[PDB]
Each structure stands twice: as structure tokens, then as C-alpha cells.
Ligand binder design. Structure first.
Ligand code: U1H
Length: 330
């Protein structure tokens, strides 16, 4: 079987993408952020502290005939940006774009950080990293992808994120009409639980391609591109008036500048990120300083190929026994 769901940016800057997901019987539809950098399916619920909910749609397990409390199970998670959430755990039926999994762990948020509360468009997260990162204790739970794998035609899902436009998450098949040329596959390391791979180098604008190994993760749940300081410095050196700002928290640039493209390597292939994708607009309303979409990973400790990079490509997450990552131009 297969599934296919449209994913929509939550705002005019593509800060995150939401995808409708059916939970429970009868279906309760929530808009979840599909996150290949985490492995928990957690949702705002009727159990979330009332003051911590501001316009989100909430999952109500008491109205689902298929919901079952997973007795004794708790979850607690903290994301790389400082966000956090925790609660108890139900099992229920979960469908994405026609693909249905029964008995999926649905982690009901009893407490959520302020970052999630103030984002009324995101009802929760659907983790698509490897199940070894799932935070449910004492019995670790499987992701939606892991539970669906056996019934999928192929153990793959693809991310086709749009630039200021809706996109598609497909499960179980590869849409050969959604990309140009060939797909280049590269090996994945699962040792940290991420879709971790090694880029073969980079180029700035029309400059020469620098062959160098960049280890990083493919993360749909991260907005920007986080690369080593040496690469990020070489990119922003080409932008007139760009500088790293300690008060803003990263590289900013005059909103009047035009940004060069950024090219990253996938084996022998090249993926080009247009300069317009790296513009994240004024740092405050009316400011003439704009925020850059390529930032340094030095504070984070791992390089992150977030949405800025992934939306320039058609990306295959091949979850075979030897996992691989496929990239194609589109
Ligand atoms: N979007 C999930 C996510 C967030 C942060 C990290 C970090 F910071 F640990 F790399 C990994 C994955």
C-alpha cells in the first residue's frame, strides 16, 4: 500500500511545513510537522495544560473508539532549539494520505514549551528519524514509518518541499514525474539515530567547487541550513555588507543585496540552492537588515541540511535494511 499527503508552509517564509494527519475513530484531523530529525509522534491534546494551548487543534482520546492508554508509559523530549514537551502515551489508529497504521503510539502532550504554544498552526510533530531515538519509557515505541514499513509497496518515503508553495510527502513509492534527471543515492549512517550522510563538497555562486567531506543530517524539522564555520564564512564573504551579529544570533545582510546560490555535493551530483531561498527577510518589521538562511553549526555540534537545502531537491528516504538517501534536481 501507499500514501500521499500535501504539505503546506505555515507562513510566508517557509518556517515550517504542516501536513494533515487523521488520528482516531472517527478521524480527528491534526496538522502535524513532519520531522525527519526526531522519532516521536506527539500532539496537543485534551490533556495539555489549558494555559499552554492557543488555537491549536487538540486530540481528544476520549472521543476515539480505538484509543487505548499505554499504561505506565511516559515521554519527555527536548529539541536542539531548547523546545520541550512531555506527557503520557496512547495507542490509536493513524492515517496519512490514505496510509493507515493501527496501534500507533500517540504521545499526548501534558506540558509543552512556549515555542509550541505561540505557534497556533502546528498541532504536533510526526517523527521520521529512526526508532532508536523515540523517548517513550519504559517501552520504546516505533515511528509511523517503521510501523507502516511492512505494508508499504517499497520501504521508502519522499519529501518534495515547495518554495513558498505546497509540496508532497509520499509513502511507499517514488513519483518519477516529480524530478528531473537521475536520483543520486548516498549511504546513511544510523549510528546516532538520524538520517546522517556525507556531502561531497560545496560551491558559492558561480565559484569553483570545493571537494570536502561534510557530515550532516537530512532534517525536514529544521528550517535553515547549518554548516561548519569555514563554509558559512566563505558564503557570506561574497555578500556585500554581510556580517555575523551577536545580538541577532547569526549572519545578517542588507536587505537590498542579492544573494548568490549555494551548491552542495551528493556523490558526483550537485544540488543548487537558489539565492532567493537563503533570504529569510527582515530581522524585525521595517528593518533594512535581513536574516540569512545559511548559518554556522559551531554552536550545535552537528551539521543540519534543513528545509533551505531539502526544498531545492526531491529527496528519497530509503528505509531498506541498508538505508540510503536519494537526491534529485527538480
Ligand atoms: N528537527 C529535529 C532535531 C532538532 C535538533 C537536532 C540537534 F540539534 F540535536 F541536532 C536534531 C534534530
Amino acid at each position: 500500500s501507499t500514501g500521499s499527503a500535501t504539505t503546506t508552509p505555515i507562513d510566508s517564509l517557509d518556517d515550517a511545513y504542516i501536513t494533515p494527519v487523521q488520528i482516531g475513530t472517527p478521524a480527528q484531523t491534526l496538522n502535524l510537522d513532519f520531522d525527519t530529525g526526531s522519532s516521536d509522534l506527539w500532539v496537543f491534546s485534551s490533556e495539555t495544560t489549558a494555559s499552554e494551548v492557543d488555537g491549536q487543534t487538540i486530540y481528544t482520546p476520549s472521543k476515539s473508539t480505538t484509543a487505548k492508554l499505554l499504561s505506565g508509559a511516559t515521554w519527555s523530549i527536548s529539541y536542539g532549539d531548547g523546545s520541550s514537551s512531555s506527557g503520557d502515551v496512547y495507542t490509536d489508529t493513524v492515517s496519512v494520505g490514505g496510509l493507515t497504521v493501527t496501534g500507533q503510539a500517540v504521545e499526548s502532550a501534558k506540558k509543552v514549551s512556549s515555542s509550541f504554544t505561540e505557534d497556533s498552526t502546528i498541532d504536533g510533530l510526526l517523527g521520521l528519524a529512526f526508532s532508536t531515538l523515540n523517548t517513550v519509557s519504559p517501552t520504546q515505541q516505533k515511528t509511523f514509518f517503521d510501523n507502516a514499513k511492512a505494508s508499504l509497496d517499497s520501504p521508502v518515503f519522499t519529501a518534495d518541499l515547495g518554495y513558498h508553495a505546497p509540496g508532497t510527502y509520499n509513502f511507499g513509492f517514488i513519483d518519477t514525474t516529480a524530478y528531473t534527471g537521475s536520483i543520486t543515492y548516498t549511504a546513511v549512517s544510523t549510528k546516532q539515530g538520524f538520517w546522517e550522510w556525507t556531502s561531497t563538497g560545496y560551491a558559492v555562486g558561480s565559484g569553483t567547487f570545493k571537494s570536502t567531506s561534510i557530515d550532516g543530517i537530512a532534517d525536514t524539522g529544521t528550517t535553515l541550513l547549518y554548516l561548519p564555520a569555514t563554509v558559512v564564512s566563505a558564503y557570506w564573504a561574497q555578500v556585500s555588507g554581510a556580517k555575523s551579529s551577536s545580538s541577532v544570533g547569526g549572519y545578517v545582510f542588507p536587505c537590498s543585496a542579492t544573494l548568490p546560490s549555494f551548491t552542495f555535493g551528493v556523490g558526483s551530483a550537485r544540488i543548487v540552492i537558489p539565492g532567493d531561498y537563503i533570504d529569510f527577510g527582515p530581522i524585525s518589521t521595517g528593518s533594512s537588515s535581513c536574516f540569512g538562511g545559511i548559518q554556522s553549526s559551531a554552536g550545535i555540534g552537528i551539521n543540519i541540511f534543513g528545509d533551505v537545502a531539502l526544498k531545492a531537491a526531491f529527496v528519497v528516504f530509503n528505509g531498506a535494511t541498508t538505508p540510503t538517501l536519494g537526491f534529485a534536481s527538480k
